[PDB]
Design a protein around this ligand. Structure first.
Ligand SMILES: *[C@@H]1O[C@H](CO)[C@@H](O)[C@H](O)[C@H]1NC(C)=O
Ligand SMILES: *[C@@H]1O[C@H](CO)[C@@H](O)[C@H](O)[C@H]1NC(C)=O
Ligand SMILES: *[C@@H]1O[C@H](CO)[C@@H](O)[C@H](O)[C@H]1NC(C)=O
Ligand SMILES: *[C@@H]1O[C@H](CO)[C@@H](O)[C@H](O)[C@H]1NC(C)=O
Ligand SMILES: *[C@@H]1O[C@H](CO)[C@@H](O)[C@H](O)[C@H]1NC(C)=O
Ligand SMILES: *[C@@H]1O[C@H](CO)[C@@H](O)[C@H](O)[C@H]1NC(C)=O
Ligand SMILES: *[C@@H]1O[C@H](CO)[C@@H](O)[C@H](O)[C@H]1NC(C)=O
Lengths: 49, 249, 299, 50, 49
């Protein structure tokens, strides 16, 4: 059960925003300036790390 | 005068082994293993052997060009790069002789088979009218094999060159020989095809042979010995063993 | 705490402080011709933009404010106030004239007619952009027509790419055959400039300055005096804008003629080449160490 | 307040109607407006001081 | 070998950028506005921590 719960929590953690405008990379890429979308991707990368 | 057609060409294929390695930057390193991602010549691939004897020498340029010449009579000199080889677009006119090299970017009206009278260029282009880019420097070409690498990135044309003595061999040798940069220029034009120039005295029968290859974006692992030179390289996209070696560094 | 028990404690580290400062710059005596780039009383069209190369001169950017009546700089990789200290390899100056509302299109990662058909900037651009109004010089009561821009191109332009070919653009399957009939158009249109237009439709002169980082021997930078060279001492050094502190010693490394710097495993400069005398030097951090204090109880 | 719906939006022509300098957008970028597809558009207009 | 590899990795980690414009503090200090260079130093500090 410990392993199952840990894996489930790790999967569930992917839906967080971490202070960005969205939790989906495609929306950020399609809605923002390429030189500006980097500061949004950085937060997601740091949170997932 | 006017354009004339007098050159014929034949083709063959051969193997490249491990050739076409150049220093990626002007930084000194020693006793290290470095990883680079750049346009390189893949190991163990087709390279085309062209034999010109006296024709559509407008070969594609693609990302980059690797040129190899093993002759001695100095029959080879200069290059042309462009997209349509007409007066409607600008093109390169690299020309070499025993004293100087002149690089010109204009809207030349190239002939089907350009060459030198030998020392005039009326056989190359009819005329050039409107242009800006001109450059003059020391000539590039100075039992020996000469290797050249031409590429362009973000409007910058970069050339690498190397000379290496070779013994009596009918194919490319085995080993490693790094290339050093010589020229970087602000070209800022569109390049799709390229050609080759020859100097013919008067005419007279002529023969030449060279090797042509194409570059691709690849990741390489280079080994710098304690002495500043590159002595070994590993291509990380050749076989699973090389990928494992690159992963383990 | 005000009381210490018996034992040994690690307190701090000792280091050796520098003695003086060293500046080494190459022989440059000419002045960069920034004057000729501005006040040229003739600016090329956006679709055919001029490009001037600046090298082997001393650059004094503070005088640039005296040539054009612009408001402020717009730099990306550097700061306007720090331009007098860095030393580059080559400088490139581009100049053209555009409309008022298109000035925002001259920036990395931009999209628009001018961005993809006339002038494109790389996503890793390092330079400055200076734009200023020129309504008193590029406007006529009847309407100026000497400035043109390209409308339709088959593909998007690459960074720092120029297009001059004038042809008949085709929009259908039938060939144009060099006539401007249906589904065949001209590729260039002229701006309509009048002095009675709004601020967003008035002509604007734009100059872009592009710099090159230190990969080759430097040629362009400001008027900084060069001092003598000292060795075997803990000193501050400044080699062509590369600043640091340490001890400089003679080097036994065999640099290739096209190499100028030496790096180590941790990506730090450890070998340098003097700009004036082509000599190789090694840099070593000054002496340092850790200090421990041994004491019994304070009672 | 005007409601805009059931039409093809070409924002690039907006620069030809008013002599403004530049856009000021918050949730999106001005250059990416030609790709996104919304549900409703609302336009408000008034006059204020500088 | 574990200790040797850990120390080597710790030393090698100093060449990362962590989203900044450079991995050298002197270049950032000499190329940027003092009130602006702080946001670049912060990323390096966080990564090294
Ligand atoms: C090279 O190209 C030829 C024809 O394009 C092909 O038959 C051959 O398999 C390729 N590879 C080698 C090693 O010859
Ligand atoms: C080589 O070409 C340059 C370029 O025009 C020319 O000035 C020079 O005289 C040529 N060399 C000889 C030996 O003619
Ligand atoms: C160059 O191109 C321009 C524009 O197409 C044309 O007017 C001119 O005649 C051409 N030749 C020269 C020498 O300027
Ligand atoms: C460059 O020339 C080729 C050759 O026709 C063309 O297909 C391409 O659209 C041009 N532009 C770019 C950016 O490649
Ligand atoms: C290193 O370079 C020096 C330069 O003369 C040479 O004497 C020496 O043999 C070289 N050593 C190796 C291992 O290449
Ligand atoms: C240079 O620009 C200044 C602007 O104040 C102008 O007064 C001067 O005439 C210009 N010099 C020329 C055009 O030679
Ligand atoms: C630069 O000038 C100094 C002083 O005149 C001289 O000693 C030095 O040789 C010069 N540098 C070069 C590369 O000629």
């Amino acid at each position: 059960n410990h392993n199952a719960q840990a894996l489930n929590t790790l999967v569930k953690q992917l839906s967080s925003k971490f202070g960005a405008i969205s939790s989906v990379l495609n929306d950020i890429l399609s809605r923002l300036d390429p030189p500006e979308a980097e500061v949004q991707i950085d937060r997601l990368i740091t949170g997932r790390l | 005068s006017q354009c004339v057609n007098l050159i014929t060409r034949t083709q063959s294929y051969t193997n490249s082994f491990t050739r076409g390695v150049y220093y990626p930057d002007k930084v000194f390193r020693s006793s290290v293993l470095h990883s680079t991602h750049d346009l390189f010549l893949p190991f163990f691939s087709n390279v085309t052997w062209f034999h010109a004897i006296h024709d559509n020498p407008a070969l594609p340029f693609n990302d980059g060009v690797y040129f190899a010449s093993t002759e001695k009579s100095n029959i080879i000199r200069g290059w042309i790069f462009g997209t349509t080889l007409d007066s409607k677009t600008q093109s390169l006119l690299i020309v070499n002789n025993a004293t100087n090299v002149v690089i010109k970017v204009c809207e030349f009206q190239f002939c089907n088979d350009p060459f030198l009278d030998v020392e005039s260029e009326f056989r190359v282009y009819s005329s050039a009218n409107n242009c800006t880019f001109e450059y003059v420097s020391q000539p590039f070409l100075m039992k020996n094999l000469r290797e050249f690498v031409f590429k362009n990135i973000d409007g910058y044309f970069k050339i690498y060159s190397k000379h290496t003595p070779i013994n009596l061999e009918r194919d490319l040798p085995q080993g490693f020989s790094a290339l050093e940069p010589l020229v970087d220029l602000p070209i800022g034009i569109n390049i799709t095809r390229f050609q080759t120039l020859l100097a013919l005295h008067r005419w007279t029968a002529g023969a030449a042979a060279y090797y042509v290859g194409y570059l691709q974006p690849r990741t390489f692992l280079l080994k710098y010995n304690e002495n500043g030179t590159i002595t070994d390289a590993v291509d990380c996209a050749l076989d699973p063993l090389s990928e494992t070696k690159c992963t383990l560094k | 705490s005000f009381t210490v028990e018996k034992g040994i404690y690690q307190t701090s580290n000792f280091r050796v402080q520098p003695t003086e400062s060293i500046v080494r710059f190459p022989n440059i005596t000419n002045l960069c011709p920034f004057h000729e780039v501005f006040n040229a009383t003739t600016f090329a069209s956006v679709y055919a933009w001029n490009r001037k190369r600046i090298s082997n001169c001393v650059a004094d950017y503070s005088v640039i404010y005296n040539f054009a009546p612009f408001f402020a700089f717009k730099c990306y990789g550097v700061s306007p106030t720090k331009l007098n200290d860095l030393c580059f390899t080559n400088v490139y100056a581009d100049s053209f004239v555009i409309r008022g509302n298109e000035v925002s299109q001259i920036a990395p990662g931009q999209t628009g007619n001018i961005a993809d058909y006339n002038y494109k900037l790389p996503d890793d651009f390092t330079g400055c952009v200076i734009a200023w109004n020129s309504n008193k010089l590029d406007s006529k009561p009847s309407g100026n027509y000497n400035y043109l821009y390209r409308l339709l191109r088959k593909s998007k332009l690459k960074p720092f790419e120029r297009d001059i070919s004038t042809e008949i653009y085709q929009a259908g399957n039938k060939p144009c055959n060099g006539v401007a009939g249906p589904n065949c158009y001209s590729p260039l249109q002229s701006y309509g400039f009048r002095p009675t237009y709004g601020v967003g439709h008035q002509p604007y002169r734009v100059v872009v300055l592009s710099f090159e980082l230190l990969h080759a021997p430097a040629t362009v930078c400001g008027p900084k005096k060069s001092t003598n060279l000292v060795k075997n001492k803990c000193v501050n050094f400044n080699f062509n804008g590369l600043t640091g502190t340490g001890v400089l010693t003679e080097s036994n490394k065999k640099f290739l003629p096209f190499q100028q710097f030496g790096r180590d495993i941790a990506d730090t400069t450890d070998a340098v080449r003097d700009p004036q005398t082509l000599e190789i030097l090694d840099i070593t951090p000054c002496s340092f160490g850790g200090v421990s204090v041994i004491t019994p109880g304070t009672n």
